[PDB]
């Protein structure tokens, strides 16, 4: 298990992509999956040690580009939408 | 002028109370948000 890294996890039958983090979700001692009103996998109980990991889909987002007119300048700034500052 | 000012202040105070007593007073806004959420929720219930 590795936390805070976008991985392709395969907890039992459940497979999927995302970053997984330790969580305070109080699973009942029998529950395995996590879900939400969107019916998507939110958290997961670690099968071999009973720990709770919420699954954030690892960061995506649009890449907007801020540019003046080409005739003005070729300098460009970029805007990674819906993401912190990760890779530059 | 004094009566108009008193009526104006009282009517504004009632506006505060009406919006407090009536949360639905903002249904026209809340419905908009609900419609968007429902559409997004429906758009996610299609990958199931």
């Amino acid at each position: 298990l590795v936390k805070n890294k976008c991985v392709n996890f395969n907890f039992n039958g459940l497979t999927g992509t995302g970053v997984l983090t330790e969580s305070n979700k109080k699973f009942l001692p029998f529950q395995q999956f996590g879900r939400d009103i969107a019916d998507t996998t939110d958290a997961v109980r670690d099968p071999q040690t009973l720990e709770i990991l919420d699954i954030t889909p690892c960061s995506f987002g649009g890449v907007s580009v801020i540019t003046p007119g080409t005739n003005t300048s070729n300098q460009v700034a970029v805007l990674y939408q819906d993401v912190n500052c990760t890779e530059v | 002028q004094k009566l108009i000012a008193n009526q104006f202040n009282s009517a504004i105070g009632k506006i505060q109370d009406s919006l407090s007593s009536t949360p639905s007073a903002l249904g026209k806004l809340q419905d908009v948000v609900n419609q968007n959420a429902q559409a997004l929720n429906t758009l996610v219930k299609q990958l199931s």
Binding site: G61 | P23, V33, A37, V44
Partner: peptide, 28 residues
Amino acid sequence: FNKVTDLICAQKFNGLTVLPPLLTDEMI
């Protein structure tokens, strides 16, 4: 603002970006 009601992130879980309004509510 207290009479109008994370869930939008739950749809964001599956490729659904929610751009912020240009005029922030304080600037509005």
